[model samples]
Target: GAMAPPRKVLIISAGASHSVALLSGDIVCSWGRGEDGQLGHGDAEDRPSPTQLSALDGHQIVSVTCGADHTVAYSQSGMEVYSWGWGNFGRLGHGNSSNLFTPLPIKALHGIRIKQIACGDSHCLAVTMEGEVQSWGRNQNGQLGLGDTEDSLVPQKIQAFEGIRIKMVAAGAEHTAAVTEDGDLYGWGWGRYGNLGLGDRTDRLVPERVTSTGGEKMSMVACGWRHTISVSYSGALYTYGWSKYGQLGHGDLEDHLIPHKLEALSNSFISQISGGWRHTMALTSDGKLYGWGWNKFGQVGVGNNLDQCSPVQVRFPDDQKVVQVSCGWRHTLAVTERNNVFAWGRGTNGQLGIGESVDRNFPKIIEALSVDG
Candidate 1:
């Protein structure tokens, strides 16, 4: 059945079991499980359709992210941050271990203009407009990059990179990675599965620079639950870490401790890449989408539940040109050049945003989110 009226979607974030979308009016909508209040609504009831987050009614949400059981949003213009959901281990940055069913301003982050925010399972990293990185939450695997295994209930700056300016940040279930303004990439936290990409399965207490195989600079980086992917300034795609389901895109089930360039897209220029729990997707410069890794539930968007070791183009209805993409734990969401949003994969909690709780094996346009402007 058709859902809400279609509006231009500006940003979209798919989490482990829920999804959040930022509409053109700066209105934030969410769906799926809220048992832990990850949906940012005032209740813990599952929503089968996009519902506006009333708490953020007046604030302009610039950036939004979803963790396994929590949610984070940044108001670029307001220079404020909001968080809710599973606040255990301080994932909400509220300096406490309590869950909030609605959006609450993180008072500790007051006065700082947040540029971006990324969340792991129960940890989160926030980047400031001045390039400072702050983290809080579970540190069991040293994912906080604070040089200790102590969990913080408040935000703390990653002082190791004091002099460097970080431009991009990404988080996995138990690991974290970032790219510096100088094109240097660094990672820390859980590496037991070689997710740190430091050529070993050892966890890092502080940030460690990720050296490219060819000594080239990195332009972007992303992390899966226990895997990592990086794209060089030269359009080279490198992957490492857990390969149990071939998430490394290396055509094998062997884990990689260091970055290895994908031979399949050797000559292709990649613009962006995203990783789900066990799958990965990439958008080429030519407006095409490629996916690989686990596809047990058709998360790879290849028309079937077949795992791929290498990159495979994602099929879209009428051959629409994909401009942006985001991956949840077992689901996928993409935006077309025409400002249309599409979703597929596991929707047991209404994550697919198709007005129901069912899985989709192919790209299905979310009519209630066709924001053309």
Candidate 2:
């Protein structure tokens, strides 16, 4: 895990089984499945609406993120992190695998000034102010990047990333990727499908620098269930790993063991990127959106069930410019320049926040009920 000081609060974040948003006045709202107490509403009941999570009140939380069934948040000023939800394999950094119905600060990281956090299915990563990476949770596949396949209930520094300050980090279902302040990318963990971009299908037990960044400085990195996506500082996008569902945007279903730049979208500059279980989404500098991969539940935002193998524009209402995007297991969320949030795809468990359980292939403004709490 690596931490960096971020000023502006990030928009909504989507998890594999839940969704969360940081509301005004620094309030936390969540909905969808909560059987694991992922919703942090003080009970085990599922929430159909985005209700306020009072447990974190006055914590001065500036950022929040969701994992498969867990939440990771940090108070910017205080440099404190509060984790809760499914704790299997010690994913919550609690020193033991105990499910937390409410959010609690990781005691070991109390004084560490962490800047940002990234969560995977059963593991997590954080970056410290020192630009060092810390890892915890499930390591059956070595996702923790601790040089071994073992879970750490408490955060452990990745010795391989000790010297350089990692500016950004991302975690896939079983693999991990992080970027150093120097703009170099490193990957590790489950790589059977070439998700690690190391030109092989073997897992990495420690951080390995990705040599095929097209000789351009890297900027952003994101991971899906079994694939990884990255955007270079030059605005070029790259994909690697699993592509069975055409998630690679390479016009075919072939796994890429190396980072392949997307020529289809090279004309446009991408600013943000997010990955779903088997899908990918990107926001361009000019406000255009692109998606590819499995659309069984319309998670690709193609307005149909057909899967996309290449970059395709997902237009917004009246050509409104979108500012941010996030992907869930089968749903997608985005915010327009107007700050209006729109959601589409899977609605089961009411993760879409549209007051219903029906799927919407097109982006629809999240109902007013989503923030009324």
Candidate 3:
């Protein structure tokens, strides 16, 4: 298969059945299932290799996020957001709930410049440059944080944070979380598994502050299908929610209703975190990769299919420092300091990009693109 142009990788996002990569040259590529047009190739056919999104050929795409069956892309200069694929419940930010076969701008947000985007299984969230937040789509569990379980077909600003500036936002399968400029964290929606980080398993129709007994300030937050992970300013890792397949990384299958510090890595400084359907992965300041959670398909990349309830260091053939990590439904991807990309776990839909349909229990390099210093 032909490889993409030599460019440093910027970011990577994985959906249930597909994957997307952003390169330094403002180029975006996607592969795998496109039955719902999630691939952004202007068609609904499955792609087995990385394919450039020609529709956004000239746009300066900066960030991208994916849901189970749809995708969202943001343009930095135009201050615009575009979405396509399964539009059921209006997750695509379109005024109507219709699947889009091509990238289309969300005209409803014309005047507002979106800086970031997050996607849930059937809903989506957007953060504007003014620190305003908007959401639409499925609200069965109030994932939209609209204070009501009504699905919106168009972008709607969240009224609760009217005067507050939200610095970051995250969406899980059925929940949402956000971080304020002051480092405070708020969460709402599905709390059955305590994904909200509250002290009980009860859903919230509105955003509620997530608290720590020690009054720690949060720097980052990530949500899995039924769990949540966060990092504090002091470089401490906190986790809550489901542990059915050991996604909690607590050394046992026990769910926490409140945020619990991951004491295992207390000494290592955390830099980034991401979650998958049933797995969790994080990067350390020293560029080390650590992972835990579901391993049904070896998504943990620890060289085995065994599940882990505690963090395990991922072994690589070389001592390359990892700079970025992303998790798919049952797979994982990472980029080293050298900008080289690697993937492991489920490859049933070619999400691994290794030119095969077999699962990998260890990290495999993708020879499609070369990264330069």
Candidate 4:
């Protein structure tokens, strides 16, 4: 081949049964299950290896996130957000319940000047440059922070965060969390087991400050199926909510009602954090990686399908250091310092982006650059 490759992965994400990558040239690659057109490859076909999206080649994308059954992408040049995949509950933000076998810009987000985008189990959230948060899709439990249980097909600015100036937003199965530019954290929705970190097992239809963060200013926030985690401005870590599988990494299988500092990792600086359906992962400032929680499918990447209540360091082969990590429902994807992608955990649906359908308790390098429906 005379053409030398110019592709370099800038970000990677794992969904329920699919994987997606954002390359340096605004190119997008996806693999694994595509039953509901989640891959953005112009069809409902599944791929075993990474393949550039046939329909999304013309757009300039900046960031992308994988939903359990959908995908969302942000375009800085166009100031728009695009979504496709399963059309249930209008999670695709198309203003109607129609499966999009290809990518389409959300007309409602045309002038939003999106800064970042995130997807929930059945919802989507977009953070604007002005620090406003907009949301849509499944709101059965008020996960949209709309102060109601009704689902909206189009993106609606969350009024509860009017004067908050959110810096980041995270959506879960039926819950939502946001971090302010000032490093404050807020949460709402299905609060069973204190998933909202509000110190009470009660649902919040509107955003409420998580006052028990132990005085730590949270910078980054993430949500699992039923748990929530945050990284403080000072690089410390906090976790709360359902710990049935020790997803909270509190060294016990008990639900936490408030943001609790993870003593095991309090002495270290955690730069990034991600939550799975029932697991967690953290990357230290030194590029070291650690995982804990549900491992029934080897999603924890510790060479065993055993649950761990405490953080366990993952020793990458050849001392490879990770730059970023993303957690799926039961799998994980990581980008190495060299831009190499490593995947592990459940692969029955090929979410690992490996050639074969098998589970990996240890990380494996995916051959190429890198679905959920």
RMSD of candidates 1 onward, in order: 2.9, 4.5, 2.5, 2.7
**lDDT (Cα atoms) of all candidates against the true structure:** 0.87, 0.86, 0.87, 0.88
Identify the candidate with maximal lDDT: 4
Residue-wise C-alpha lDDT for candidate 1, range 1-373, written one tens digit per residue: 7675545777888899898988866689898888998998788899877788888877988878888888899887787889989988989988789999998888888779787888988899988878999999999989999999999998999999799899888999889999997898898999888788888888898899987456888988888888888999899899888999988898899898888888899888899998899999889998899988898888888888888888889987678799889889999999998888888888899888878888887788776776531
Total backbone collisions for each predicted model: 2, 12, 0, 2
State the lDDT of candidate 4 residue by residue for 1-373, as single tens digits.
4875656778888788899998986689888888888998888888777778867776788888999989999888877788989989979887898998789889999967887788889998999989999999998888889999999998899998888899998888989999999988999989988989999999988899999887878899999889999998888899999999999998999999898889999778999899999999999999999999999989999899999999998777677788999999999988877667888898887788877888999888887662110
lDDT of 3 at 79: 71
The parts of candidate 2 lying over 4 Å away from their true place are 1-10, 369-373
| Candidate 1 TM-score over all chains jointly | 0.96
**Local lDDT at 151 for model 2:** 85
Cα deviation of 292, candidate 4, in Å: 0.6
lDDT of 3 at 360: 91
- Candidate 3 clashing pairs? none
Instruction: Give per-residue CA lDDT, model 2, range 327-354, as digits (tens).
Output: 9888888877665677878888778877
Model 4 ranges with Cα > 4 A deviation: 1-6, 370-373
* TM-scores, one per candidate: 0.96, 0.95, 0.96, 0.96
What's the true lDDT of residue 223 in model 3?
A: 87
